[PDB]
């Protein structure tokens with residue numbers, strides 16, 4: 358389907374083309390950089406997904422402690 | 433077509449990558465010869481699949497520019513500094529025809545002013561030095577004066593003569609055996625038989641002269657000049 | 666036959682070391 | 695140097711081979727349609743019919759110019775970019791201190807239609823403007839041919855005469871001294887003021903000076919081109935504030951300084 362890897366690869370390729378266009382260069386100037394950008398974007402998207410999962414776990418632990426501290430009031 | 437154009441584009445990506453790799457390899461060996469500014473002029477230049485088709489017995493000066501779909505026939509000659517650009521349409525040159533030094537034979541760059549007319553040059557035609565032909569037909573055995581300009585739509589009927597420095601306005605027809613000249617081009621007089629003989633004999637003399645120049649240009653490049661340029665201080 | 670610029674050669678070695686080391690870093694983590 | 699030097703050289707060989715193979719594959723994918731750029735076959739000076747051009751020591755010939763056949767060019771003259779001097783069927787003579795400007799054609803005739811066929815003679819201190827066309831005619835000393843002008847066979851431009859820019863001078867027409875002719879066909883326009891005579895001389899001398907800097911640039915070798923490219927980049931901008939903090943004064947290298955005779959002042 359629409360995995361993180363594909364979204365990241367597309368974003369990285371688009372980032373290399375956008376950069377070339379902002380510099381008035383042909384869209385495909387230095388194609389090996391387009392390959393590098395695809396790889397880096399894929400890696401970044403997958404790592405962002407993993408980091409988001411980890412963040413949620415940490416937040417749940419923090420929210421559990423906050424609710425325990427708040428429930429201590431009614432003791 | 434479109435698929436050929438896509439393969440041509442993707443091909444350029446592979447070539448760009450390979451040439452970059454070669455430059456890397458030369459850099460690791462401490463060579464900078466790829467930084468040398470050498471002329472990228474091509475005597476015959478293609479624009480995708482529109483390439484020039486030149487007969488083997490046609491002389492083309494190395495400094496001349498033949499771009500796109502250009503047809504040069506047998507015994508014809510493209511002299512020093514000439515430019516022929518048929519890209520939006522075609523440019524065809526007949527046999528035994530001389531296009532003299534610094535002449536420009538091209539078609540309209542854009543179709544904004546209507547459909548782009550091709551340029552047709554007939555047989556045994558003489559085109560004088562620094563003449564401008566722009567989307568016009570020039571029939572067989574005609575004489576285009578040097579420094580003259582022919583605009584799109586013009587027809588120079590067989591045995592027509594355009595005087596040196598003339599400006600033949602758009603869509604003008606030059607009848608046979610007439611000499612037209614001036615800006616704007618206007619009928620001057622009729623062509624005499626001696627001048628017809630001169631037309632044909634001049635086209636023949638230039639075919640022999642083209643042959644002589646082709647042999648001196650095809651002589652192998654001299655190594656001594658190369659070593660002198662290389663060892664300068 | 667031989668590349669003379671020593672500093673260039675050391676830089677090349679450093680770049681290769683960085684690439685192989687990054688690959689090993691991924692491979693062992 | 696050393697073993698590491700040899701290993702890196704060998705690896706560079708492998709990378710070069712891979713790069714050229716990839717270039718070949720990319721050419722195949724293009725359908726072989728692109729015509730390959732080749733070494734330059736244009737010859738600045740060429741022989742034809744066992745005739746060699748006789749060119750003085752101090753003559754600027756632009757590498758893109760074409761000097762062919764029986765051409766004589768005298769001291770201090772200059773042949774500019776795109777000029778074609780084809781002396782294949784007759785002689786072309788250029789005097790001293792004469793400039794033939796960009797994209798100009800000079801040709802001769804073997805036998806004109808009627809009358810005695812003559813070679814092409816261009817005298818001393820003559821200015822010929824851009825994209826002029828000189829065909830089998832005579833230009834005498836201290837004359838001026840305007841840019842885009844056309845002299846046909848048998849034309850004589852006399853001393854201190856001018857042909858206006860863009861003119862068409864018909865066959866056998868004689869421009870006498872002191873006059874300027876112009877138009878299509880060329881005809882008398884007015885007399886030449888003395889200030890214009892001084893202008894003609896100044897034009898010839900200015901072009902003598904311009905030819906020097908152009909000739910010096912066009913004859914530099916690859917190494918000197920690289921040296922001057924680096925120097926030009928080095929001195930393109932400045933930080934005189936930081937220089938004054940360091941207490942140094944960066945000076946423009948002499949190879950980037952033009953002589954004063956070509957400067958506008």
Ligand SMILES: C/C=C/C(=O)SCCNC(=O)CCNC(=O)[C@H](O)C(C)(C)COP(=O)(O)OP(=O)(O)OC[C@H]1O[C@@H](n2cnc3c(N)ncnc32)[C@H](O)[C@@H]1OP(=O)(O)O
Nearest residue numbers: 823824840841858859860874876877883896897898900901
């Ligand atoms: C040191 C560096 C040196 C160089 O590189 S300079 C060489 C390149 N520069 C040139 O070739 C341009 C030199 N200057 C000229 O040629 C110039 O024109 C010229 C030298 C005829 C003279 O041009 P003027 O500015 O002096 O024009 P005039 O008023 O004297 O002439 C009158 C008339 O001539 C006509 N006019 C004038 N000049 C020309 C022409 N040429 N053609 C046609 N028609 C013209 C025009 O009709 C004018 O009005 P009308 O009678 O109503 O027609």
Ligand SMILES: [Zn+2]
Nearest residue numbers: 561801802829
């Ligand atoms: Zn000629």
